[PDB]
């Protein structure tokens, strides 16, 4: 199970000029390219070692896509302003994501595409990849063009054919790094949290991919979890915690499940 | 490779 998702953001700036537009591309949990107008290179560029040997034709094309997407979104920001009857003075956000998924078998599992105005769903491509879901009275007017157009068709064509073809190519290009599983380095901390109480924090460090299951169990179970965070070197880190009776730590064992571990690992607090 | 065609709303 692998993915090729991109995340496009456009933000209007009534003070300054043209909206700020940013694209980022991810193979699974690894970013590999990005585009940013209001930047030295008004161009798509690599963001992973293994993309640095793609030819000029690749970058010249993928730049044209990003720049064109930005120009259309420039219009969309002003369109949706009209729809919702908002003033020029206010700054608004428009986000577009799209992703395909491969199965174990290596074939297309699923594809999805949504855009959101001001951090709330606007228009959504449904599971069947042929019909849109409009959140709002306004989104229906947009949808009316998207339906009548058969954007559905064009986006299905990307998600089913192009997206998976290129996901495959990237998985091979960056196979050394991407298709490698790094398991978590696991340890257990302890902090008084008073006299009668005590904390037990179970750490998992340096694991790719970011999907992981930390669970705190006692013999015969209310755990605090924190958003898995980026290490800043491809790998990730996460911790789960539990408040236990002071001096009864040894009843409590941490269970770490990762794709890159032979068998799920079990921890206890080091005396 | 990103989606080569995008929605006009």
């Amino acid at each position: 199970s692998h993915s090729l998702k991109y995340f496009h953001t456009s933000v209007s700036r009534p003070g300054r000029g043209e909206p700020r537009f940013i694209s980022v591309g991810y193979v699974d949990d690894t970013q590999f390219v990005r585009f940013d107008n209001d930047a030295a290179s008004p161009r798509m560029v690599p963001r992973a070692p293994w993309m640095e040997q793609e030819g000029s034709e690749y970058w010249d094309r993928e730049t044209r896509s990003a720049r064109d997407t930005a120009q259309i979104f420039r219009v969309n920001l002003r369109t949706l302003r009209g729809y919702y009857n908002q003033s020029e003075a206010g700054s608004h956000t428009l986000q577009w994501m799209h992703g395909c998924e491969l199965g174990p078998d290596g074939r297309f599992l699923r594809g999805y595409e949504q855009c959101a105005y001001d951090g709330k769903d606007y228009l959504t491509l449904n599971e069947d990849l042929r019909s849109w879901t409009a959140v709002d009275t306004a989104a229906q007017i947009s949808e009316q063009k998207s339906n009548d157009a058969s954007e559905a068709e064009h986006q299905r064509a990307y998600l089913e054919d192009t997206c998976v073809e290129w996901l495959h190519k990237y998985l091979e290009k960056g196979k050394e790094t991407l298709l490698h599983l790094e398991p978590p380095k696991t340890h257990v901390t302890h902090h008084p949290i008073s006299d009668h109480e005590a904390t037990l924090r179970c750490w998992a460090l340096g694991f790719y991919p970011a999907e992981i299951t930390l669970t705190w169990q006692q013999d015969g179970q209310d755990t605090e979890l924190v958003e898995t965070r980026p290490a800043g070197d491809g790998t990730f880190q996460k911790w789960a915690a539990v408040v236990v009776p002071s001096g009864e730590e040894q009843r409590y064992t941490c269970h770490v499940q990762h794709e890159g571990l032979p068998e799920p690992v079990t921890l206890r607090w080091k005396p | 490779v990103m989606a080569p065609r995008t929605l006009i709303a």
Partner: T-cell receptor
Amino acid sequence: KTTQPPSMDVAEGRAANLPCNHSTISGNEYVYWYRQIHSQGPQYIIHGLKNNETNEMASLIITEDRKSSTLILPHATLRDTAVYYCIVVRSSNTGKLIFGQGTTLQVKP
Amino acid sequence: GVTQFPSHSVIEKGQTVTLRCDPISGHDNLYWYRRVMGKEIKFLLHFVKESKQDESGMPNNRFLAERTGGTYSTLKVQPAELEDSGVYFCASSQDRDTQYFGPGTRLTVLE
């Protein structure tokens, strides 16, 4: 990028099979057919990607290998005498037409 | 149907001509193509509403195209030159797949 005969003849009543070559096509490149009856506005006929397509006017037959295509005007008329442009359009946000020389079709009375 | 104006045009080299086009009402996408003497029909410009999306086919500084209203579009040649002589075809599209072309403005710049 897209190569056709310079000119083709068809006795009216009988179907006109307009061939087109595009070996260098990708999976994100659709095959479009337009025409021009004397020098008035170009007119969209039909288009497709991989599977066969029929519409009110014509049918488009793309090969399995997708290198070759055939446009079928089912029963040719004196109206159908025109220049027939076969154009590849890569899925983009403009989808501009690049016009080849095109097949000039004479519908023989 | 797309409407263009004028149907025909004959001007002296150096003079200023402006072509008009009214797209099928509702169509967000407006295109300019042309066939100069010799060559085939070639793409000039693509508008997505009032905003220019693709200028890649616009020859030089002498050619200026505007669709501020986001409806009908103008195209001003200033100054007009001999080599400009050709047919100028406007088109509109709802889906950007089917382009509906107008009857075309026929332009002859004459020494």
